Nucleic acid binder design. Structure first.
Length: 189
RNA sequence: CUGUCUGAUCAGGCAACGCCGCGAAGCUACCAUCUGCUGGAUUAUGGCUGAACGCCUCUAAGUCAGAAUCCAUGCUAGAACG
């Protein structure tokens, strides 16, 4: 409808410094550094003070304005991943065949190896994204821990694990086997 | 091997390739043998992050995987005015 101005406020906490130039966003915190490129969006940024940043769209229509909240949420995930971390938990679900999951290394590169899924002889390997750590949890039986600074990478790599274990040619309501994301939270609470 | 002709023998001619067995060479037969490649991008579909719409949502920005599909690799010709 061509709204004259739309604003969003980024709350940037005590231990972070969000550096922005030409829609390239670099968020430094106690757990490291995260970068995001936003050259595909027409937005502008204002430093209100050290603890707040204003994000603005001028003369935007409905969809251009819809992108504004998305921009703010993405940068906020950057901040909360550089200060609090991100941790996704996966549980192994099976009826008869135990799912054997190991973190192996080939070509000097880390992989997640899933064996005996529904008794299949095929072995499944999922490449581990950069900055994402996998860890077989010890407190809980049959649980995988996916952690990292980037919410996007951690969630995508957990989804890669969940999608590789789809059941074919069966009633999935009955054959409920798989590896599913059970908890989505933060490393430090 | 038959009939006939060269007097006989030897050696030959002819039968509008005379007839029969074998027959190399060459050609040839799923009637024989050999050989038929591996990268990227997608469709349907299933997802991630995520607004619009304080919630939600695979979608709007962004993004992942994925078909005998598509484009290459490979193969054939080589523009007779490249």
């Amino acid at each position: 409808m061509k709204y004259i101005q739309t604003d969003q406020i980024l709350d940037i906490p005590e231990g972070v410094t969000v550096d922005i130039k030409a829609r390239v966003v670099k968020v430094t915190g106690p757990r490291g550094e995260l970068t995001k490129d936003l050259k595909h969006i027409d937005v502008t940024f204002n430093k209100i003070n050290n603890r707040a940043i204003k994000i603005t769209v001028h003369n935007g229509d409905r969809k251009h304005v819809a992108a504004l909240r998305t921009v703010k949420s993405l940068i906020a995930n950057l901040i909360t991943g550089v200060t609090k971390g991100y941790k996704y938990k996966m549980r192994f679900v099976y009826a008869h065949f135990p799912i054997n999951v190991n973190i192996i290394k080939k070509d000097g590169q880390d992989y997640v190896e899933i064996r005996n899924f529904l008794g299949e002889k095929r072995v499944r390997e999922v490449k581990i994204h950069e900055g994402v750590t996998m860890e077989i949890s010890s407190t809980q039986k049959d649980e995988l821990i996916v952690s990292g600074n980037s919410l996007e990478a951690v969630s995508q790599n957990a989804a890669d694990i969940q999608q590789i274990c789809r059941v074919r040619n069966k009633d999935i309501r009955k054959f409920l086997d798989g590896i599913y994301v059970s908890e989505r939270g933060t490393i430090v609470e």
